[PDB]
Every structure is written in structure tokens, then in C-alpha cells.
Amino acid sequence: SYRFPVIAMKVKKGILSDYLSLNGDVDTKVKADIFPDAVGKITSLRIKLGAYVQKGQIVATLDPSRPGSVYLKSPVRAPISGYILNITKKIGETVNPQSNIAVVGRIDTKQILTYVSEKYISNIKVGNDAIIEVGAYSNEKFKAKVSEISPILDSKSRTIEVYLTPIGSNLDKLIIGMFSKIKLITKRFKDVIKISREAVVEREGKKFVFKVDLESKSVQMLPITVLFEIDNIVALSGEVEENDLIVVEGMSALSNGSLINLVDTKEGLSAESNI
């Protein structure tokens, strides 16, 4: 007793990656709005979301109709072949030839569009890896690669368009028209000691961590350099080796050489990338 207790980490070398948090939409390179030829009322829908349609195929029907006439017309036809990606009108609604009824296009030319601000663009290059996230779980995250950076800077919004091509499998669930968080990876620090942000401790205008010595059951305060910090993880360099025991809870009470009580040893952070 009179000793300060702890939980430590079995520290490991790994990869900490820098990334930009962006927002983007799932688009397709080949799509088109279905516009009617006549003004009038929707009498039937012969399409469902998901349906493949031939160019010129009848998709919706209208009133025959007017007083009148003399051009009694005209069904709605698909402007190109493809899949129905959206339906924007229902039975009963009236439509002019500038009324978007639905969208058709290809499901195999998926593309993520995102507008990177002027101040962040510099660190981006074609071939960069990215994670497209629509949710928190494994089925809701997909891999991608930067395909194309526009040379044009929209002087209005101060942004450059970056396009990303998704890769891997599960891409079925990456649905066209969806919103996505994008994590665009600009760099990776390989072969660095990774530790939770908490273990790092500012005392006297300098950062340290606490290495545990199992034989003497006490700690040593070592000066450390933070190389990079992200996701509440820290990459560092120092006289910390693989498998050293560094404290990840209870550093408020400690000084250099203070005795301790090791309650449990947490397993190290993944040797592979944070993202």
C-alpha cells in the first residue's frame, strides 16, 4: 500500500495513417433523366426501382387525351438503356417535358464525387487509397482509390473535384445516389510505436510516457517525440521498444521512479493500419 496502481499496454509497432475526412455522393458515369414528350397525368407505372429497361421502352403512361388533340400522344420512353436508379413521380401527378420522372443508368460505372477544399488538396494524388463509409459496421465500409483530380478550381466555392473508384467486393451494397463519408488516406507511418493518446503526459512543458519495470514493480518516465497523432492514437519515437509495458490508465498520480501495482496488461494496438 501507498503505491499508485495501473493498467498497462503490451506496446506494438504498427502503421498509423493520416487521412482527410470528406463527404461525397455515390454517382455513376452513365445516367440520364427520363423526360416525357407530352404534358399530362400519370396513369400507370411500368417500372420498379431496380428494373432493366431497353432504350425506347415504355416506362409510364398518361392521359390519351385532350379536347381536342390533334396529336393524341404520348407514352414515356426510356432515353437510353440501363437500370432504374430512381423514381420521382407517382400515379396521379402531372408532368411537363421538364419534369424528371425517374433516372436510368449503369450500375457498373460507380463513382464517388467529393469536393476537396483548396487548403487540403495538396496532399492528394491519384492512386491514393480511401475508405468509403455509409455506416459503422463492416458491411457499410468499402475500399476505393482516387481516380481523377480535376485541374479546374471552382473559384466560387474554393474546391477541387476529386473522383474515386470503389474496388473490392460488397459493392452491391454501395448504392447509387447514397451519401458517404470518405476517409482519403494521404500518408502512412509504417513501423512506429502506437499508443492511446492518454498514455502521453505533459509535465513541465514536455511530453513523456511511463515504462513499467516488472522486476522492481515501478515506472520510469521517458521523454518521447509524437510523430503523428490521429483517432486518439499516437505514433511515437523514443527508447520504447516492442513489447514494453507503458501505462494506459493512471498517470495523473505518477512521477519518475514511483512504485506501482499492475492490475492488468492490455494487448497492444493493431500492427496493421488504423484505417
Q: What is the 3-state secondary structure (H, E, C) of the chain?
A: CCCEEEEEEECEEEEEEEEEEEEEEEEECCEEEECCCCCEEEEEECCCCCCEECCCCEEEEECCCCCCCCCCCCCEECCCCEEEEEECCCCCCEECCCCCCEEEECCCCEEEEEEEECCCHHHCCCCCEEEEECCCCHHHEEEEEEEEEEEEEECCCCEEEEEEEEECCCHHHCCCCCEEEEEEEEEEEEEEEEEEHHHCEECCCCEEEEEEECCCCEEEEEECEEEEEECCEEEEECCCCCCCEEEEECCCCCCCCCEEEEEEEEECCCCCCCC
Nearest to 141 by CA among 113, 178, 180, 176: 180
Rounded Cα–Cα distance for residues 192 and 267 (Å): 16
* Residues 151 and 77 grouped into a single domain: no
Resolution of the coordinates, Å: 2.6
- Of the residues 85, 104, 123, the one at which a domain ends: 104
Q: Is residue 39 a contact partner of residue 94, using CB atoms and an 8 Å limit?
A: yes
Burial class (CB in 10 A: 0-12, 13-18, 19+), 207: middle
Overall residue count recorded for the chain in this entry? 275
CATH of the domain at 270: 2.40.420.20
Please give the span between the terminal C-alpha atoms of the chain, in angstroms, as a whole number. 42
CATH of the domain at 144: 2.40.30.170
* Residues 162 and 26 grouped into a single domain: yes
* Residues 26 and 131 grouped into a single domain: yes
- Of the residues 157, 191, 225, the one at which a domain ends: 191
CATH of the domain at 54: 2.40.50.100
* Residues 91 and 213 grouped into a single domain: no
* Residues 196 and 274 grouped into a single domain: yes
- Of the residues 162, 191, 220, the one at which a domain ends: 191
Q: How far from the centroid of its chain's Cα atoms is residue 138's Cα?
A: 12
Q: How was this structure determined?
A: X-ray
Q: Which residues contact 274 (CB under 8 A, 6 or more apart)?
A: 15, 16, 17, 194, 230, 231, 233
C-alpha cell at 177: 445516389
Strand pairing report for 4-10 and 260-267: parallel
* Structural domain range at position 109: 15-32+105-191
How many structural domains is the chain composed of? 3
What is the Cα Rg of the chain in Å? 29
